[PDB]
Each structure stands twice: as C-alpha cells, then as structure tokens.
Design a binder for these strands. Structure first.
Ligand SMILES: [K+]
Ligand SMILES: [K+]
Ligand SMILES: [Mg+2]
Ligand SMILES: [Mg+2]
Ligand SMILES: [Mg+2]
Ligand SMILES: [Mg+2]
Ligand SMILES: [Mg+2]
Ligand SMILES: [Mg+2]
Ligand SMILES: [Mg+2]
Ligand SMILES: [Mg+2]
Ligand SMILES: [Mg+2]
Ligand SMILES: [Mg+2]
Ligand SMILES: [Mg+2]
Ligand SMILES: [Mg+2]
Ligand SMILES: [Mg+2]
Ligand SMILES: [Mg+2]
Ligand SMILES: [Mg+2]
Ligand SMILES: [Mg+2]
Ligand SMILES: [Mg+2]
Ligand SMILES: [Mg+2]
Ligand SMILES: [Mg+2]
Ligand SMILES: [Mg+2]
Ligand SMILES: [Mg+2]
Ligand SMILES: [Mg+2]
Ligand SMILES: [Mg+2]
Ligand SMILES: [Mg+2]
Ligand SMILES: [Mg+2]
Ligand SMILES: [Mg+2]
Ligand SMILES: [Mg+2]
Ligand SMILES: [Mg+2]
Ligand SMILES: [Mg+2]
Ligand SMILES: [Mg+2]
Ligand SMILES: [Mg+2]
Ligand SMILES: [Mg+2]
Lengths: 89, 199, 134, 74
RNA sequence: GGAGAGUUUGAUCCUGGCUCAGGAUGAACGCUGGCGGCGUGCCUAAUACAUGCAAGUCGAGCGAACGGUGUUAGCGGCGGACGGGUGAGUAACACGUGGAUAACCUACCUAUAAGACUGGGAUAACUUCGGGAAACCGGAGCUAAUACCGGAUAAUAUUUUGAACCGCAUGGUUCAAAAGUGAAAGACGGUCUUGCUGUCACUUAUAGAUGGAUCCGCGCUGCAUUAGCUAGUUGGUAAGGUAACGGCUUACCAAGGCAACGAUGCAUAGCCGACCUGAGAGGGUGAUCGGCCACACUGGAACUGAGACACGGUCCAGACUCCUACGGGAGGCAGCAGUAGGGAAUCUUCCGCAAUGGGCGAAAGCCUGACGGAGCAACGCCGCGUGAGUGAGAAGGUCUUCGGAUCGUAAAACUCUGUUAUUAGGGAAGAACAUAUGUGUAAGUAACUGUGCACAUCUUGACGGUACCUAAUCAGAAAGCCACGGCUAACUACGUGCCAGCAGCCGCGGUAAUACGUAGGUGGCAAGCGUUAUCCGGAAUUAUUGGGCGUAAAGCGCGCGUAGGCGGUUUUUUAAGUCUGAUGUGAAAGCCCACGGCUCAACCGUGGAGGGUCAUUGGAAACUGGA
C-alpha cells in the first residue's frame, strides 16, 4: 500500500527525517512518490515540523496511510482533524 | 603549539621578526646554521614566492595543510584574493586573543585558547583556528580572570588595532569590523603568495 | 584536414604504453588465463641471483631473476649495499627501471618478505627496509 | 486525445525518412536516413512517391506505421 | 579563467620525441605513530564453503493434544515476488532522455453502491496396525473451519438488434434492449427482543492511488588485416495463443528483409545520476549513495499466486560435496559474520530491535544480520596536541683561515598552563508513541458498545554511565619521514677511489665527490613522510576551440569518373536548419551560492542556481536547405 513515512537522513547519532509518500515495498531511503515535509527530533527546542498541509490531505484522501510517528506529526499540525472533518462533511 | 622549535631560527632564516619586535634579528640578521655568516647567492623566482608564504605561515603558526585550506576559503569571497586571505588570518581566535593584548606572544595566545581559558560570545571556544566574525565578544573564563599571564600582558597596553575594541578592566574584547590591508602586517607581499599557489 | 574529412575520419590519440607490464597482469590458475589488474607490487621467487655489468658506467650491479606470481619472468634490481638473497628466495617486486642495466625494469623491495633491510643504513632507511636504531 | 508521430518520406520498396544528425564534436550537419516499414492497406502507393506516415501499434514483426496520405506521386 | 623547465650542437635557430614540477585513489609497500569526529574497508576466484544467525505471523478463522487461564504440533489466511547480495551474462529498446497505448494487467489501501441466501462432502491433526538405519512411507478408522464444493439471487462483463455523436486507420463514448452467464463468511463485542446493532473480516461493480507490461524518436565501445547476413527469415491470409499488439506459434501463399549512413562476425562492457581531472573544449572512472536492468552452483521447465518461471520453493538433467545399516537419503553464503584458497591487499563467527522502515496481528505484541549501534584498520578528510613566558651565548656535537663559527633562547634556571592524560563526582538529547484509562466532539444508532478526531494520565534506550560538565595531580607518557649539483626550497666534513654504490632526466663515482655511505647543519612536510601502480594535466604531442605536408614525418606517378561534400546573381514562397518566447520535463543525493546546527572544521540540514543535441506549442524571415 501507499504510506506516509519517515526516511532517515543526517549522520551518525544525528538523525534528520524527511516525511515522504512512498510505496510500502520501496526501501526506506530509496524511491519515493512525493516529499511532504521534514522532521527533526533532536533539535534544540522544538522538533521542527515542516509539513505541507495541502499535500498531506491529498494523499490521505487518496488512501495513503501514515506510520505511527507520522500520524503523531500530522496530528500535532492539525492535519488529522481537518482530514476527519472534511470526510464527514 | 604545532611547530615548537626555535622561533629565533625561523625569524633569521625568513628575514622577518616573528615576535613583531625585532629582538630575534638583533645580533645575527642572517640564516641559521653553519653557512649563516657565509652570504649565499640570490633567491630564485620560486624561492621568493616560497619565502613569502613561509613568512605568513610561521607568523600565524599554522601547518601548511590548514594554511592552504584558509587560502581556498578566502578565494571564494568577492574582492582581491590575497587581501581576503590576510583578513581571514587576522580573524583567527588565535590571533585575536594576541591582538587584544591578553597574551605576550602569539604562542601564549594559542595555549590560552587551547587550554580553554577563553570564551567567545559567552561560551567556551577551545579551537585556535576559530574564525571570529565582526560583532563577536571575546572574554576570559571566570576561573582564569586572575592569572599572572593574562594580568601581566594586559597592563602593557599596546596598540590594539582599530578594527578591535578591548576593555582592560572588563577583560573583554569586541571584534568591531573586518580589518583593512593597512591594519595588517606590511612586511608580507601577499601578491607573491597568490602567485605561489598558481604554480 | 577539412571538417568533412574529420567527420569521415575522426582524430585518434596515440595509445600510451606501460613501463612495468609485468605488474599489470594477473593469472587465474583455475581457468589458466591472464587477467589485467594494475598491481603496485608482485610477489615472486628468485630463480637466479647474481651480478651484471652496466652499459660509460662500470660496476657489478646485483640483481635477481624472478618468476612473479603471474608466471612471468623478470629481471629485478637489488638496491642497497648488501643483500641476503639466493635461489628460492621469496621477494616483493615493485616498478622502476634501472638505467645502464638493459633488461632490468623492476626493483626488489628491501625489508619485505624474505629480503632483509640494508645493514648499517641510517639515512633514508624507509627506502631500504631498515628499522630505526636504538 | 494525444498525438502520434508523423513523418514524410519517399517509398523505397512497394519509406525513407532522411534526417540530419549534427556531429557531436565538429558541429557539421550530416544527412542520415532510416527506412520505416509501413502499412499501405490496398497497395496504393508505388516506388518514388513521397508519402505521409503515422505511428501505430505493432502490425507485424517490423511494421509500426500506417500510410495516411500520398503527397507527391512517383 | 590559461606559468614552465631539462635534454640532439663546438655554438645556433627550428622540428620532434622523451623526462620533470600539479591533482587524484577502494590503493599497496617501507620507516614511523598520540588523540577525537565523520566517512570508507575482497578491486583478485560469478572460487569452494565448516558453524551460527538473515521470514515469519495470526488462538478474536478451526479442530485436537498436553499442561494449569496457558502452550504445542496440525488445518486455514496473509507474508515469503519486499527488504539484503552480486555484476557473471548482455552492444540490447538493457540503459538515458522524450513520447504513445483507441493493443494492456494491478493483491494489500481509499471512496461510492448493492449484497452477503440455502445445502453438502472431504481431510490433516488424532487413534490404531505396520514397514524402514535414516529421510520418510503405507493400512484402518475419526473430525473442524473465514478450508473445499453444489444450488439461489446480483451485470456495467458476453452475443445479437440497432441508434446517436466523436476520433488518429484499426476505431472510440454513450443510448438501449433482448438472450445466455458469474458471488459471498464468519469472528469478537453491545443491547437484548434473539431481533437489531459496532469493529474487523467476505462478494460484486465502478473510480482513485500504487506497482508492473508493451511499443516508438534520438543518444550508446573497438576491429574492414571482419563484407556479405537472414529462409519464420520479410510481408499476406487464417487459426491458435497472450493481460496485451505482434511471426508470438503453426498452416498455406508470395520472395522479400538487412548492409559501406557498416549489416553480420569476433572481442570488450551491466547502463545512468554521479566521481576524478581540465581554464574550457575535452579526457578518464562507475567502489561507496540513489534509479533502472540482469543473475542466485550450471542448464531446462513449470506449479502456486495479484505478482515468480521464485537467493535462504518445487520438478528434471549435470558437476561437486556429505550421511548410509548400501535399500536408500541430503546440500548450494554473489544475506550477515566467519573459514580455506587466490592475492600486493580489504575487518567481528559482536550488541539491540530503543529509533526509522517492513511482514503478520483487533491489539498487546512477535519476527526483522533491513536497520540502529559497538569492534578492528592512519585507508581518507577535518580538528587538537606532543607545552607556554622570561632566559647570554654554559657544557657536548660539528666545522675551523685554532681568532672563532654554528647547533642556540636551544638547554639548564625561574615561573605559568592542563587542551590532552590519570583519579574521582555528576550526567543529555536521541522517546515519537502504541496499548490502556478517563472526558469532549463527529458520523451513525431506536439506544449502547464500539469507530474517527482532540486533550489529559501511563510504559519504553542497544549505544551507555557513552557525549558532555565539574574538581584534583603532573611537563610529566605523546615526532617522525624525505630531501639538500641543476630542474627544486635547503652545504660542509670524513670515508670510499669507475669500487662500493646513486639515478625521474641531465648524469654522478677512475685519490681534494655539495650527486656514493656516514656525520653535523639546513630545507620541506608533519601523525605522518616517502616509494610503487594507475588516470587527467602540463602535451597545441590528434590541434572543433587549437597543428601540419618545397628541403624537418607528410601531395597518391598521372587521368577519367561514382557516391558524398561544396557550390554564381535576383524575385516570390516555404519554414527543415537558424533565431525568439510559452508550457511540460530533465527524481533525490551530489557540485556551486546563501543561510542554519555541530565549541571550530570536516560533516549535517534547509533554500536557490546549474545541467537537454529533450519534447510540444506561438512568433521572425537575413543566411543554409525545399518549391
Ligand atoms: K654537448
Ligand atoms: K524495530
Ligand atoms: Mg524531544
Ligand atoms: Mg569511523
Ligand atoms: Mg567482487
Ligand atoms: Mg561459490
Ligand atoms: Mg499454532
Ligand atoms: Mg479483498
Ligand atoms: Mg474461501
Ligand atoms: Mg563482464
Ligand atoms: Mg589544456
Ligand atoms: Mg496462476
Ligand atoms: Mg524466495
Ligand atoms: Mg544462501
Ligand atoms: Mg559471508
Ligand atoms: Mg595469500
Ligand atoms: Mg515499527
Ligand atoms: Mg529468527
Ligand atoms: Mg601503513
Ligand atoms: Mg636552491
Ligand atoms: Mg639516496
Ligand atoms: Mg673525499
Ligand atoms: Mg644530486
Ligand atoms: Mg650523499
Ligand atoms: Mg592533520
Ligand atoms: Mg599524463
Ligand atoms: Mg598529458
Ligand atoms: Mg607539430
Ligand atoms: Mg597542401
Ligand atoms: Mg631526407
Ligand atoms: Mg620528407
Ligand atoms: Mg604529383
Ligand atoms: Mg612512387
Ligand atoms: Mg561540522
């Protein structure tokens, strides 16, 4: 299936994550469909979430499913609330 | 430091006072070693560009690898390459600490930075090659504001250059703005060093 | 030539040749075939040590006959004053022809495999396989 | 919809589509030609006629084009 | 953004090769060796492989068994076609770039709609009787299901009647309107009414998304001392076949098809983004990271499946290895480690699923040599040390024109520091969650449970007591390598006597060697320094940019002439080249610029720029081409 997930970048002990839409079978750091943001869990003060809200809802409405961590990221940006509100309405 | 040999021998060979004072080229303004008094011939074209490079390199006390890397860094900014190189060398935390007056010699200013006695903008900087930017603040760590090396150097209030500001009572310095070629040593014909790295 | 001649028959650069051809070949024993690998050195066995006279120069230059690990026979020079080599010695061979000695295109590495370092050497020891004294 | 590639050429057996390949190094244009085996339906065209062709699905082992229009008679 | 020098002569100017100074590496070797960070590490034998691990999961689909709510083997579902490895084959639509499919397939996911009715019979497990060293195989019975199979209902799918409209030829989109034909399943809960109902699961249809397939334009290494190649070959008709078009296959008919614009054959090679070099034009490379392809001991097949003709599946043939009680059985590291071998040369039979990702599961969770980490190696890059300040010419070494000179402010002496080191105390981030528990809200409900969404509480770290920080003590443990005639920075003495030796080139050594060896001194670098190998540069030394051919290498002995190349003046026209906009595309990483985080720097991250001989489309008309 199509996933919204985190691909690892950065260096040893210093992880940086891009938020990508990718086929489940694609290797973690390989072929993607579309990048929709970034995520930096080791930042100084705030985890530095940078999600493209219009792109995230297009893929969510197209059947793409987030991983557990990406679901928390999208929730912290209110994308999950807008997805649920737009589905019922 | 890195090179821990006789700075007197190096100043005599290069024909430039490394201490900035002139006490090394005092009695024997000729090359060290057995053939010192015996006057040698002229210097080749290569031997003139090379001697210019060693003048700068041994003044700031750097290895050739780090010296050439700074040259490449300086060659990427807009302006005259050779002058940008001289400005970058003067901005070393190695040389800022000495130019402010916190140490007697350029080698003493290196051991202070290396041993963690110096702060930059309030935080400790241990790296002598640290490239200080204009506006930064260099100070002494609290446990070292009363040390004889720093105290004795400060009371000899020398000509602190006009691109720097120091406050002796505060033991704190300010990197006001980038130096100009006139505020930097005039015994170095930097056009030869640019040619040296062209061949 | 004309542009049309160049289009019909383009330029061709001269092919460069190697000064140490015996180093740039391997041997697959299983398939009994020669490879091309560019080695920096090759192991070998001394078939015949001895001396040879130079081409203006006059001396007795020490050398060995070596069968390399790729089954190629070469003449290799033995640098330094005195050596410990004889027949059936296992030597490491590097490139570098010795002028004045026709047919000797390689050097034996001092201080590698069975070859000893030069005895009593104190300057440029790493070129002659001699450990630091004291 | 979408557009299928169109060529104009001369029948060499009853289509030659001579084009130019600019030289990579010297910049001179050199004429080159490629023969396009095409489907003529009712054997209408003949040798030397200048014809228009359009790309189609594979029709045989080597035929990928259909003759649409005859331009200049033999 | 572009540097030269040495060497042919008694001397010269040319021509011309050779050599050297630069950069780089998956390097190796020699001498030497303190630390930290980040990266990299079988290039050779696609050689053979001992041992362990690299793919399972679901009891909320099912029966049984054993244990006291748990678990085991089995049936069943899904996964095992991913992820990981390798570059043997391949000169080809394999790959890059740009298109087409009105000739295509698509599990899981999402959305919408309509459903999910009624029967049946097996069989593994199991029990029992055997046969075999084993691997395993037979006989008898037994039994379940979301396993399997009948029947019913369901059409957009198929046939025929047509019709309307449209396209790029085959054709395509609807409108019908009759005939055949095709499904499904329960589990766990709530309410209870045994009816309704929640979640997950099931069937059909249609879309979306994803992934895959086919075709086509252009681009792709040498050798012509490789010139002929092909007979399903090339086209047609028909049938068969496929997801699909098609000589894809067969039958019959015709004699085509390819090639000097290089067919065919031989050899070599996975291709690209990128990487190294270069002023650029170019030249060289494909290890690491990413995309695509191919392969899985060798060769041939097929099965299951949405997907394989399948690395850790099956069948067959072969080579090889292993067990055997001789009847018979077993195996495939180009997964991660590791071994042997080959080699100049390339690492631990480590820790953990804490993070990211993947499979299964309602979930808890389980599995995961992917991965995240640790270990080894100066292999590379970056950073920091091996002390600092003051200190007039001590001794000792070396040279001496025995006055002295030099090593040398160097040492000692006096103070100072603790980066590092040792000892001790503290000690991050990387962690987001999920589950569960509460409230609130949305949809739905007759209502509830549940579901989606939100907030609040809870648990979880391999690295690791690591990074880092604080205190104490001590200059104490921490410098080597090459060179010094010229190119080319840096010279003296002694020994040797064309010997021993040196050497990239010129060349040096035959009794006063700055070139051999050592010593002192000096120069260049520095945890490295040299040597070798290889590639680009210098090399305008294949010259498009950017060379030549009277005598230096170089005008065919000379005609005629084919292909090709090139071609006088003007007008009209065209728009292939040419020029100029628009649109799309040229992934990400990389390079370059800017900014941010790492104490700095390497490095990491973010935003731009660049890179096409690309395609499609609108303009211009001087030149080249066409009329
Ligand atoms: K001469
Ligand atoms: K995990
Ligand atoms: Mg946090
Ligand atoms: Mg490392
Ligand atoms: Mg290999
Ligand atoms: Mg093998
Ligand atoms: Mg079980
Ligand atoms: Mg389904
Ligand atoms: Mg079923
Ligand atoms: Mg190959
Ligand atoms: Mg050039
Ligand atoms: Mg099947
Ligand atoms: Mg498999
Ligand atoms: Mg295996
Ligand atoms: Mg292995
Ligand atoms: Mg070996
Ligand atoms: Mg997970
Ligand atoms: Mg396991
Ligand atoms: Mg080493
Ligand atoms: Mg000199
Ligand atoms: Mg020597
Ligand atoms: Mg002598
Ligand atoms: Mg010499
Ligand atoms: Mg010597
Ligand atoms: Mg270093
Ligand atoms: Mg070269
Ligand atoms: Mg060159
Ligand atoms: Mg010439
Ligand atoms: Mg001529
Ligand atoms: Mg002649
Ligand atoms: Mg001639
Ligand atoms: Mg003539
Ligand atoms: Mg003749
Ligand atoms: Mg950094």
């Amino acid at each position: 299936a199509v996933k919204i997930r985190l691909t690892r970048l950065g260096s040893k002990r210093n992880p940086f994550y891009r938020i990508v839409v990718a086929d489940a079978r694609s290797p973690r750091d390989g072929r993607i469909i579309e990048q929709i943001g970034t995520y930096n869990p080791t930042s100084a003060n705030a985890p530095e979430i940078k999600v493209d809200e219009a792109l995230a809802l297009k893929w969510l409405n197209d059947g793409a499913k987030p991983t557990d961590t990406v679901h928390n990221i999208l929730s912290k940006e209110g994308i999950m609330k807008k997805f649920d509100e737009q589905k019922k309405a | 430091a890195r090179f821990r040999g006789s700075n007197w021998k190096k100043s005599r060979r290069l024909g430039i006072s490394l201490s900035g004072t002139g006490k090394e080229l005092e009695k024997r303004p000729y090359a060290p070693g057995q053939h010192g008094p015996n006057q040698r011939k002229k210097l080749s074209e290569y031997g003139l560009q090379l001697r210019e490079k060693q003048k700068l390199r041994y003044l700031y006390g750097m290895t050739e690898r780090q010296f050439r890397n700074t040259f490449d860094i300086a060659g990427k900014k807009f302006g005259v390459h050779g002058e940008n190189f001289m400005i970058l060398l003067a901005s070393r935390l190695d040389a800022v600490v000495y130019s402010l007056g916190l140490a007697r010699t350029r080698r003493q200013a290196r051991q202070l930075v290396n041993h963690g006695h110096i702060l930059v903008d309030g935080k400790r900087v241990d790296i002598p090659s640290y490239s200080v930017k204009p506006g930064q603040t260099i100070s002494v760590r609290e446990k070292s504001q009363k040390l004889n090396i720093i105290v004795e150097s400060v009371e000899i209030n020398n000509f602190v250059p006009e691109y720097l500001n120091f406050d002796a009572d505060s033991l704190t310095g300010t990197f006001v703005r980038l130096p100009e070629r006139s505020e930097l040593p005039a015994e170095i014909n930097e056009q030869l060093i640019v040619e040296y790295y062209s061949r | 030539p004309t542009i049309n001649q160049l289009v019909r028959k383009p330029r061709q650069s001269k092919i460069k040749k190697s000064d140490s051809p015996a180093l740039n070949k391997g041997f697959n024993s299983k398939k009994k075939k020669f490879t091309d690998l560019n080695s920096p050195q090759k192991r070998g066995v001394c078939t015949r040590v001895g001396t040879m006279t130079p081409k203006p120069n006059s001396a007795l230059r020490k050398y060995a006959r070596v069968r390399l690990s790729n089954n190629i026979e070469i003449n290799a020079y033995i640098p330094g004053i005195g050596h410990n080599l004889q027949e059936h010695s296992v030597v490491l061979v590097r490139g570098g022809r010795v002028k004045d000695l026709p047919g000797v295109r390689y050097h034996i590495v001092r201080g590698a495999l069975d070859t000893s370092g030069v005895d009593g050497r104190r300057q440029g020891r790493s070129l002659y396989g001699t450990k630091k004294p004291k | 919809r979408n557009d299928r590639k169109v060529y104009v050429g001369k029948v060499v057996s009853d289509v030659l589509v001579e084009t130019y390949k600019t030289h990579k190094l010297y910049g001179k244009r050199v004429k080159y030609s490629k023969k396009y085996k095409t489907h003529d339906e009712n054997n209408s065209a003949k040798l030397g006629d200048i014809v228009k062709i359009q790309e189609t699905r594979p029709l045989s082992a080597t035929k990928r084009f259909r003759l649409v229009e005859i331009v200049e008679e033999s």
